[PDB]
Amino acid sequence: LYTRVRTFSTAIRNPKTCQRAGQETDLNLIPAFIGTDTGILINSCVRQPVIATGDGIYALTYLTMRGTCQDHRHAVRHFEIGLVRRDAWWDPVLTPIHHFTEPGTPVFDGCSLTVQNQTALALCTLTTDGPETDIHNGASLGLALVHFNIRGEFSKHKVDPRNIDTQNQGLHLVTTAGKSAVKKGILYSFGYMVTRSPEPGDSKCVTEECNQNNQEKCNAYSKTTLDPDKPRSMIIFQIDVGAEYFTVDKVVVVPRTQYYQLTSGDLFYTGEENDLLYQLHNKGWYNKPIRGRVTFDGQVTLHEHSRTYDSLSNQRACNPRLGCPSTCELTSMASYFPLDKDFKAAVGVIALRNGMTPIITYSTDDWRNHWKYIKNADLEFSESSLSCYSPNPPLDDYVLCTAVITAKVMSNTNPQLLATSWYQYDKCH
Amino acid sequence: YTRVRTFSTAIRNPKTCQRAGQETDLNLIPAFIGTDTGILINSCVRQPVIATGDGIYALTYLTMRGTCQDHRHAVRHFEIGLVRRDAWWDPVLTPIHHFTEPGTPVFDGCSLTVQNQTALALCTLTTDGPETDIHNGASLGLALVHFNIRGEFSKHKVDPRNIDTQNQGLHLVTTAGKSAVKKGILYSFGYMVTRSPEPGDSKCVTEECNQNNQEKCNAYSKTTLDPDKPRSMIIFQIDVGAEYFTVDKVVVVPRTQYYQLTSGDLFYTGEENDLLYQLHNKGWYNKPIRGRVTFDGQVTLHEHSRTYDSLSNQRACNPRLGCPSTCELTSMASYFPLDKDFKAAVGVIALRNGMTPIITYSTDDWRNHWKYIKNADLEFSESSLSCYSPNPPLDDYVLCTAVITAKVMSNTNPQLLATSWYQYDKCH
Ligand SMILES: *[C@@H]1O[C@H](CO)[C@@H](O)[C@H](O)[C@H]1NC(C)=O
């Protein structure tokens, strides 16, 4: 059988109160030989990467298309599960053991991903041309729960979205790509919901001096409508995947007061009795990290942390500048992962400047301890997913992180899948 | 498992019609196989071998951090998967199970073939690589590796004491390439360190090179390790399920049959047909080296007269490539038979300067056409190529998949890339 290398998420740990030191030496990057070839030679497009780790196990998912990024009809959904194994340097590295593909059509879109014990769980949307195009065309959408385990078993189960409690407001339910979390047998994941009535209230905005009515621009570009007749709200799905008592599958609205533009995100497990953490993905005009704590009692609140030490940018400036509400959209996102259950310390993968040059950033509160290169080159990347994990028993000064990015390799106009891991400094003083 | 049934193009009768060059552009399709191999960290991938069976493929390769000369810390990868219809209804390769064996010792020089639902690899167990181990006075092991589409994996040490060498073998080494199974016997290339030097001249050329070619051919033939260690090319014969009693053995490929000691591929053509072969261009000889293998009376490599493809380096050699020298091609060529005679062939080769991977398509000694894998200044080092027909076959095409080790984004080491294509196969 396989020997297990025990690991756990850094996000379940108590925060360190000591000053976290910047690492003086350069990064020890180590192999993450996961995923597949994704068509660097033929300029294929990889979208929606999500990585998740458990106890000696990781899982990975992504969507591939030939030639363009706008061909959902002929896309292929990839799923993968693998192990943490000691290599010839005795480093714990990720390596795949089973891979699965599901070609369209319909295709699995916007899959979330988590690892529970020996099983990966993905909640996905069944679509022909992509959810927004299907909804516009008057088509319906499906949902699916996919699981696969380290034995190589694979299951896909349709979930009737009409039987999910939406307080009779939901017309369409859509999952979006990112990390999910399971607490007390309930699977939580981000998505959005087309509703009968528009959601009242102002979208979250900024008081930055932008030579305009910010709140007006914020509402206008909030992406809370798919059409004059199609309002949509951000949601968190709650699916019973093993609750102690019977629970009704439901969605809960994330009110538009809680975010700037409707977007995807990650939910980070911190323990059975601890609040989930979150990050929203910078895919619009807001160019600072969007992360913090989620609570549900009475209503869904995104308790957003005050974070300014990292800034996202595009190669070409926007008018008004990024950070000001506009129709500009960041071409390159950032992934953050909590080093503790409060998100006090964070690891990030982000572009250095101009939407290129992947770097790792390392913060405590609103202070950047250091940054290091993944690759000091003019390499653009579009999407990312990041997971950090500690061996058990832990190392004194380090944890481990793995990132997947979709990068425009060798002057390709589309992005392909690349991966890397590193020893992540975790040390006091 | 649900899969597109396939068979190797090398078992077919040669087409009696004239083969046309393809006027239309190449239809390249995804080969999303293997893993990330450290493009971001300049890892080194070596010894790639791909093999196909009936709706099944297998892949193997060796990875190292930072340099290509770190056998002590290398990792051997094995992979098996299926031929499946994608959303365009094209038959594409997709992995189902992956395996790694980190050093040390590591599996070096693995050959690879697919027998029914099981991949077979014959490998050499080594610490610092076979030549370094031999130089250091260490011994080597052999191993037979099996892994199947259900995900089962087996490795068994093979004691060289059970391999008949007519009491001449001192070390046995497998080299990376395609193997073949006929009538339950596994055949694969390798080399053998012997007690006594092999007599005879190395195969040579008569090209005017302003030198004594035969003397240079013998001197640069790589038939000696160190100063006192002669070695001979061999073909292993290992029982993997023969119906009759056989002794596992090596058979010498005499030095008259090849230019420099090197690795190669053996191509199955049917239970009752001669194997085909190719030797890998890793030295000064810069034309294809391929043809038919026979065994009745020790190994004869019946080398075809092939000149339509020529390999080149970015920096010229003095004397020029094609002339015996100590210069070595930085990029190899992979060929695959489209029939049991190797009459028609698919090739993967660099266009010029050891870069720009292209596909060539030949009949006899004529290049019908060539097509780009990538029209870019992309250096690549090693390759493996397999072509296969869906069953029932297509009228005008077959399918091919290649893996190459390419120096991506100004990396000094090469990483694993893959692609497939519809290969023109049409008459007139
Ligand atoms: C973890 O998974 C294994 C295999 O699926 C199962 O047998 C075991 O009971 C699980 N343990 C828990 C605590 O759920």
mmCIF file of C-alpha atoms in Angstrom, chain B residues 52-319:
data_model
loop_
_atom_site.group_PDB
_atom_site.id
_atom_site.type_symbol
_atom_site.label_atom_id
_atom_site.label_comp_id
_atom_site.label_asym_id
_atom_site.label_seq_id
_atom_site.Cartn_x
_atom_site.Cartn_y
_atom_site.Cartn_z
ATOM 1 C CA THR B 52 0.788 2.354 -27.218
ATOM 2 C CA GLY B 53 -1.357 -0.755 -27.177
ATOM 3 C CA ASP B 54 -5.070 -1.353 -27.795
ATOM 4 C CA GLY B 55 -6.767 1.791 -26.539
ATOM 5 C CA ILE B 56 -3.998 2.124 -23.935
ATOM 6 C CA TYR B 57 -0.756 4.072 -23.742
ATOM 7 C CA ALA B 58 2.142 4.107 -21.319
ATOM 8 C CA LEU B 59 4.829 6.692 -20.660
ATOM 9 C CA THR B 60 8.059 6.752 -18.684
ATOM 10 C CA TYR B 61 10.743 9.351 -18.003
ATOM 11 C CA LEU B 62 13.429 10.369 -15.509
ATOM 12 C CA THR B 63 13.486 13.720 -13.683
ATOM 13 C CA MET B 64 16.227 15.586 -11.809
ATOM 14 C CA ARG B 65 16.451 18.924 -10.014
ATOM 15 C CA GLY B 66 18.711 21.595 -11.458
ATOM 16 C CA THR B 67 21.008 19.447 -13.586
ATOM 17 C CA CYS B 68 20.836 16.449 -15.872
ATOM 18 C CA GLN B 69 23.751 14.794 -14.045
ATOM 19 C CA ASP B 70 22.168 13.970 -10.662
ATOM 20 C CA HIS B 71 21.233 10.305 -10.920
ATOM 21 C CA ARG B 72 21.667 9.956 -7.146
ATOM 22 C CA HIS B 73 18.592 12.164 -6.588
ATOM 23 C CA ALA B 74 16.605 11.403 -9.750
ATOM 24 C CA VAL B 75 12.989 10.218 -9.827
ATOM 25 C CA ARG B 76 11.603 7.609 -12.219
ATOM 26 C CA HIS B 77 8.053 8.292 -13.466
ATOM 27 C CA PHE B 78 5.660 5.692 -14.869
ATOM 28 C CA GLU B 79 2.232 6.412 -16.323
ATOM 29 C CA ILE B 80 -0.571 4.455 -17.972
ATOM 30 C CA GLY B 81 -3.724 5.781 -19.605
ATOM 31 C CA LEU B 82 -6.384 5.422 -22.257
ATOM 32 C CA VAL B 83 -7.221 6.557 -25.765
ATOM 33 C CA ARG B 84 -10.550 8.353 -25.353
ATOM 34 C CA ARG B 85 -12.836 10.545 -27.442
ATOM 35 C CA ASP B 86 -12.678 14.202 -26.441
ATOM 36 C CA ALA B 87 -15.382 16.828 -27.042
ATOM 37 C CA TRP B 88 -14.368 17.042 -30.712
ATOM 38 C CA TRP B 89 -14.733 13.230 -30.980
ATOM 39 C CA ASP B 90 -10.997 12.937 -31.581
ATOM 40 C CA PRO B 91 -9.144 9.983 -29.985
ATOM 41 C CA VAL B 92 -6.727 11.558 -27.513
ATOM 42 C CA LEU B 93 -4.425 10.142 -24.839
ATOM 43 C CA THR B 94 -5.322 10.777 -21.248
ATOM 44 C CA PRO B 95 -3.580 9.492 -18.096
ATOM 45 C CA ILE B 96 -5.357 7.231 -15.619
ATOM 46 C CA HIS B 97 -2.603 6.222 -13.174
ATOM 47 C CA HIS B 98 0.805 7.693 -12.358
ATOM 48 C CA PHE B 99 3.657 6.234 -10.292
ATOM 49 C CA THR B 100 7.031 7.494 -9.071
ATOM 50 C CA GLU B 101 10.093 5.654 -7.780
ATOM 51 C CA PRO B 102 12.581 8.127 -6.285
ATOM 52 C CA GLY B 103 16.237 7.241 -5.873
ATOM 53 C CA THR B 104 18.405 5.874 -4.557
ATOM 54 C CA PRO B 105 19.022 3.487 -6.332
ATOM 55 C CA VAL B 106 16.991 4.755 -9.268
ATOM 56 C CA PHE B 107 15.539 3.052 -12.339
ATOM 57 C CA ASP B 108 17.739 4.140 -15.262
ATOM 58 C CA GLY B 109 17.469 3.408 -18.977
ATOM 59 C CA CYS B 110 13.980 1.911 -18.842
ATOM 60 C CA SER B 111 12.540 0.422 -21.994
ATOM 61 C CA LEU B 112 8.768 0.429 -22.362
ATOM 62 C CA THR B 113 6.059 -1.526 -24.173
ATOM 63 C CA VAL B 114 2.371 -2.303 -23.651
ATOM 64 C CA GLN B 115 1.238 -5.943 -23.481
ATOM 65 C CA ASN B 116 -2.582 -6.135 -23.450
ATOM 66 C CA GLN B 117 -3.634 -4.095 -20.397
ATOM 67 C CA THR B 118 -0.155 -3.985 -18.810
ATOM 68 C CA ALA B 119 2.876 -1.780 -19.374
ATOM 69 C CA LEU B 120 6.256 -3.527 -19.140
ATOM 70 C CA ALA B 121 9.500 -1.717 -18.324
ATOM 71 C CA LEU B 122 12.948 -3.313 -18.074
ATOM 72 C CA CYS B 123 15.277 -1.018 -16.159
ATOM 73 C CA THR B 124 18.775 -0.784 -14.674
ATOM 74 C CA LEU B 125 19.127 -0.101 -10.941
ATOM 75 C CA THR B 126 21.880 2.451 -10.365
ATOM 76 C CA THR B 127 23.307 4.906 -7.840
ATOM 77 C CA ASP B 128 25.184 7.524 -9.922
ATOM 78 C CA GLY B 129 24.296 6.219 -13.385
ATOM 79 C CA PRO B 130 25.556 3.038 -15.030
ATOM 80 C CA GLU B 131 28.823 4.401 -16.462
ATOM 81 C CA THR B 132 29.745 6.172 -13.222
ATOM 82 C CA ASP B 133 28.824 3.112 -11.137
ATOM 83 C CA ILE B 134 30.935 0.903 -13.403
ATOM 84 C CA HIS B 135 33.862 3.350 -13.203
ATOM 85 C CA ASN B 136 33.588 3.384 -9.398
ATOM 86 C CA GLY B 137 33.737 -0.417 -9.244
ATOM 87 C CA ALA B 138 30.108 -0.818 -8.183
ATOM 88 C CA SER B 139 27.676 -3.418 -9.474
ATOM 89 C CA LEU B 140 24.343 -2.817 -11.194
ATOM 90 C CA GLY B 141 20.943 -4.450 -10.893
ATOM 91 C CA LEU B 142 18.135 -5.091 -13.352
ATOM 92 C CA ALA B 143 14.425 -4.815 -12.706
ATOM 93 C CA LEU B 144 11.230 -5.767 -14.503
ATOM 94 C CA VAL B 145 8.397 -3.315 -13.802
ATOM 95 C CA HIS B 146 4.721 -3.986 -14.581
ATOM 96 C CA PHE B 147 1.756 -1.689 -14.112
ATOM 97 C CA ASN B 148 -1.750 -2.076 -15.491
ATOM 98 C CA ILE B 149 -4.860 -0.083 -16.291
ATOM 99 C CA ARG B 150 -6.432 -1.140 -12.985
ATOM 100 C CA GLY B 151 -3.629 0.708 -11.182
ATOM 101 C CA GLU B 152 -1.686 -2.316 -9.951
ATOM 102 C CA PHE B 153 2.099 -1.920 -9.845
ATOM 103 C CA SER B 154 4.856 -4.547 -9.516
ATOM 104 C CA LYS B 155 8.650 -4.387 -9.517
ATOM 105 C CA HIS B 156 10.869 -7.486 -9.489
ATOM 106 C CA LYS B 157 14.654 -7.548 -9.357
ATOM 107 C CA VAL B 158 16.183 -9.573 -12.191
ATOM 108 C CA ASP B 159 19.369 -11.300 -11.132
ATOM 109 C CA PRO B 160 21.830 -11.053 -14.062
ATOM 110 C CA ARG B 161 22.997 -14.536 -13.005
ATOM 111 C CA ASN B 162 19.780 -15.781 -14.640
ATOM 112 C CA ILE B 163 20.614 -14.003 -17.919
ATOM 113 C CA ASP B 164 22.715 -16.119 -20.284
ATOM 114 C CA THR B 165 25.731 -14.151 -21.585
ATOM 115 C CA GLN B 166 27.812 -17.187 -22.621
ATOM 116 C CA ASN B 167 29.848 -16.316 -19.510
ATOM 117 C CA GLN B 168 31.062 -13.092 -21.172
ATOM 118 C CA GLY B 169 28.989 -10.452 -19.363
ATOM 119 C CA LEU B 170 30.518 -8.430 -16.531
ATOM 120 C CA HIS B 171 27.858 -5.696 -16.438
ATOM 121 C CA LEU B 172 24.429 -5.492 -18.098
ATOM 122 C CA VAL B 173 22.803 -2.127 -18.809
ATOM 123 C CA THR B 174 19.426 -1.309 -20.315
ATOM 124 C CA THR B 175 19.105 1.824 -22.397
ATOM 125 C CA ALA B 176 15.982 3.919 -22.793
ATOM 126 C CA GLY B 177 13.745 3.218 -25.761
ATOM 127 C CA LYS B 178 10.872 1.174 -27.091
ATOM 128 C CA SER B 179 10.880 -2.569 -26.448
ATOM 129 C CA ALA B 180 8.820 -5.229 -28.233
ATOM 130 C CA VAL B 181 7.127 -8.479 -27.211
ATOM 131 C CA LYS B 182 6.911 -11.355 -29.710
ATOM 132 C CA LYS B 183 5.575 -14.786 -28.724
ATOM 133 C CA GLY B 184 5.930 -13.956 -25.040
ATOM 134 C CA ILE B 185 9.562 -12.787 -25.295
ATOM 135 C CA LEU B 186 10.512 -9.203 -24.408
ATOM 136 C CA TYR B 187 13.244 -7.679 -26.618
ATOM 137 C CA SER B 188 15.061 -4.469 -25.697
ATOM 138 C CA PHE B 189 18.357 -2.757 -26.477
ATOM 139 C CA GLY B 190 21.207 -2.390 -24.037
ATOM 140 C CA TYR B 191 24.908 -2.839 -23.614
ATOM 141 C CA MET B 192 27.193 -5.306 -21.892
ATOM 142 C CA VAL B 193 30.678 -4.830 -20.444
ATOM 143 C CA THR B 194 32.751 -7.878 -21.399
ATOM 144 C CA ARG B 195 36.012 -9.495 -20.369
ATOM 145 C CA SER B 196 37.525 -9.358 -23.860
ATOM 146 C CA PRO B 197 37.372 -6.683 -26.576
ATOM 147 C CA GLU B 198 35.086 -7.308 -29.503
ATOM 148 C CA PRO B 199 37.096 -7.779 -32.726
ATOM 149 C CA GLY B 200 36.174 -6.138 -35.985
ATOM 150 C CA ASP B 201 35.852 -2.640 -37.350
ATOM 151 C CA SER B 202 33.011 -0.377 -36.361
ATOM 152 C CA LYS B 203 30.574 0.491 -39.120
ATOM 153 C CA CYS B 204 31.854 3.553 -40.937
ATOM 154 C CA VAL B 205 31.358 5.909 -43.899
ATOM 155 C CA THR B 206 33.270 6.683 -47.074
ATOM 156 C CA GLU B 207 32.482 10.409 -47.137
ATOM 157 C CA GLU B 208 35.534 12.517 -47.963
ATOM 158 C CA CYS B 209 36.450 13.986 -44.576
ATOM 159 C CA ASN B 210 40.227 14.606 -44.959
ATOM 160 C CA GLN B 211 40.994 11.893 -42.420
ATOM 161 C CA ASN B 212 41.267 8.147 -41.934
ATOM 162 C CA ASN B 213 37.561 7.455 -41.448
ATOM 163 C CA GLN B 214 37.872 3.846 -40.283
ATOM 164 C CA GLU B 215 40.481 4.757 -37.667
ATOM 165 C CA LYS B 216 38.296 7.603 -36.395
ATOM 166 C CA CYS B 217 35.204 5.372 -36.488
ATOM 167 C CA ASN B 218 36.847 2.759 -34.274
ATOM 168 C CA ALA B 219 38.322 5.379 -31.917
ATOM 169 C CA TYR B 220 35.038 7.228 -31.386
ATOM 170 C CA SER B 221 32.713 4.192 -31.430
ATOM 171 C CA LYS B 222 32.172 4.335 -27.628
ATOM 172 C CA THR B 223 32.853 0.583 -27.482
ATOM 173 C CA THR B 224 35.167 1.038 -24.485
ATOM 174 C CA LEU B 225 34.450 2.505 -21.063
ATOM 175 C CA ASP B 226 37.391 4.059 -19.245
ATOM 176 C CA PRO B 227 40.560 2.542 -20.835
ATOM 177 C CA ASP B 228 40.246 -1.155 -19.918
ATOM 178 C CA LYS B 229 36.474 -1.833 -20.167
ATOM 179 C CA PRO B 230 35.202 -3.019 -23.561
ATOM 180 C CA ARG B 231 31.466 -3.054 -24.122
ATOM 181 C CA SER B 232 29.138 -4.487 -26.758
ATOM 182 C CA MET B 233 25.656 -3.555 -27.838
ATOM 183 C CA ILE B 234 23.110 -6.233 -26.910
ATOM 184 C CA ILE B 235 19.458 -7.112 -27.248
ATOM 185 C CA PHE B 236 17.878 -8.589 -24.120
ATOM 186 C CA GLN B 237 15.470 -11.521 -24.489
ATOM 187 C CA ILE B 238 13.307 -11.912 -21.356
ATOM 188 C CA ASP B 239 10.457 -14.423 -20.966
ATOM 189 C CA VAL B 240 7.303 -12.446 -20.163
ATOM 190 C CA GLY B 241 4.868 -15.288 -20.897
ATOM 191 C CA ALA B 242 6.161 -17.584 -23.625
ATOM 192 C CA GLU B 243 4.243 -20.807 -24.285
ATOM 193 C CA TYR B 244 7.539 -22.739 -24.633
ATOM 194 C CA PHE B 245 10.588 -23.170 -22.393
ATOM 195 C CA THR B 246 13.241 -20.469 -22.974
ATOM 196 C CA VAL B 247 16.442 -19.241 -21.335
ATOM 197 C CA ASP B 248 16.596 -15.497 -20.688
ATOM 198 C CA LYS B 249 19.673 -14.227 -22.504
ATOM 199 C CA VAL B 250 21.445 -11.405 -24.273
ATOM 200 C CA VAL B 251 22.426 -11.547 -27.922
ATOM 201 C CA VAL B 252 25.294 -9.393 -29.112
ATOM 202 C CA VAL B 253 24.723 -6.727 -31.741
ATOM 203 C CA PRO B 254 28.247 -6.754 -33.221
ATOM 204 C CA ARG B 255 30.071 -3.437 -33.606
ATOM 205 C CA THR B 256 30.044 -3.958 -37.403
ATOM 206 C CA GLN B 257 26.284 -3.245 -37.271
ATOM 207 C CA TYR B 258 26.340 0.322 -35.918
ATOM 208 C CA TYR B 259 28.497 3.460 -35.899
ATOM 209 C CA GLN B 260 28.612 4.435 -32.209
ATOM 210 C CA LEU B 261 27.247 2.508 -29.248
ATOM 211 C CA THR B 262 23.902 4.133 -28.487
ATOM 212 C CA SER B 263 20.300 3.508 -27.463
ATOM 213 C CA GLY B 264 17.466 2.598 -29.787
ATOM 214 C CA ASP B 265 13.886 1.466 -30.360
ATOM 215 C CA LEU B 266 12.530 -1.952 -31.316
ATOM 216 C CA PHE B 267 9.213 -1.932 -33.198
ATOM 217 C CA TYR B 268 6.793 -4.856 -33.064
ATOM 218 C CA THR B 269 5.436 -5.737 -36.527
ATOM 219 C CA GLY B 270 3.513 -8.951 -35.752
ATOM 220 C CA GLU B 271 4.090 -12.384 -34.237
ATOM 221 C CA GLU B 272 5.611 -13.755 -37.464
ATOM 222 C CA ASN B 273 7.355 -10.649 -38.853
ATOM 223 C CA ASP B 274 10.893 -9.369 -38.312
ATOM 224 C CA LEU B 275 11.243 -6.618 -35.741
ATOM 225 C CA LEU B 276 12.106 -3.175 -37.028
ATOM 226 C CA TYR B 277 14.610 -0.949 -35.248
ATOM 227 C CA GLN B 278 15.995 2.533 -34.992
ATOM 228 C CA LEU B 279 19.210 3.662 -33.329
ATOM 229 C CA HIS B 280 19.292 7.086 -31.668
ATOM 230 C CA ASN B 281 21.512 9.812 -33.192
ATOM 231 C CA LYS B 282 23.579 10.921 -30.202
ATOM 232 C CA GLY B 283 26.965 11.333 -31.918
ATOM 233 C CA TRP B 284 28.436 12.297 -35.300
ATOM 234 C CA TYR B 285 26.290 10.263 -37.723
ATOM 235 C CA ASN B 286 23.541 12.620 -38.884
ATOM 236 C CA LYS B 287 21.174 10.572 -41.078
ATOM 237 C CA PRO B 288 18.395 8.198 -39.948
ATOM 238 C CA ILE B 289 19.634 4.820 -38.682
ATOM 239 C CA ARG B 290 16.786 2.354 -38.998
ATOM 240 C CA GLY B 291 15.663 -0.834 -40.647
ATOM 241 C CA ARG B 292 15.014 -4.491 -39.913
ATOM 242 C CA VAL B 293 16.477 -6.808 -37.232
ATOM 243 C CA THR B 294 17.177 -10.499 -37.723
ATOM 244 C CA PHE B 295 18.580 -13.038 -35.285
ATOM 245 C CA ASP B 296 19.227 -16.313 -37.090
ATOM 246 C CA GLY B 297 22.954 -16.439 -36.353
ATOM 247 C CA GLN B 298 23.569 -13.472 -33.988
ATOM 248 C CA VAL B 299 22.035 -10.010 -34.565
ATOM 249 C CA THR B 300 22.079 -8.340 -37.982
ATOM 250 C CA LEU B 301 20.856 -4.741 -38.260
ATOM 251 C CA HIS B 302 19.667 -4.399 -41.862
ATOM 252 C CA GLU B 303 20.049 -0.639 -42.144
ATOM 253 C CA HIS B 304 17.922 1.163 -44.708
ATOM 254 C CA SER B 305 19.417 3.689 -47.122
ATOM 255 C CA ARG B 306 17.854 6.897 -45.796
ATOM 256 C CA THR B 307 19.102 10.385 -46.662
ATOM 257 C CA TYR B 308 15.954 12.526 -46.938
ATOM 258 C CA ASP B 309 16.345 13.752 -43.331
ATOM 259 C CA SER B 310 19.601 15.177 -42.012
ATOM 260 C CA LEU B 311 20.294 16.199 -38.429
ATOM 261 C CA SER B 312 22.310 19.293 -37.622
ATOM 262 C CA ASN B 313 23.807 21.308 -34.788
ATOM 263 C CA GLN B 314 23.765 25.030 -34.147
ATOM 264 C CA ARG B 315 27.573 25.029 -34.067
ATOM 265 C CA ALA B 316 29.308 23.210 -36.886
ATOM 266 C CA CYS B 317 31.799 20.434 -36.216
ATOM 267 C CA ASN B 318 35.259 20.091 -37.754
ATOM 268 C CA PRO B 319 35.031 17.642 -39.436
#
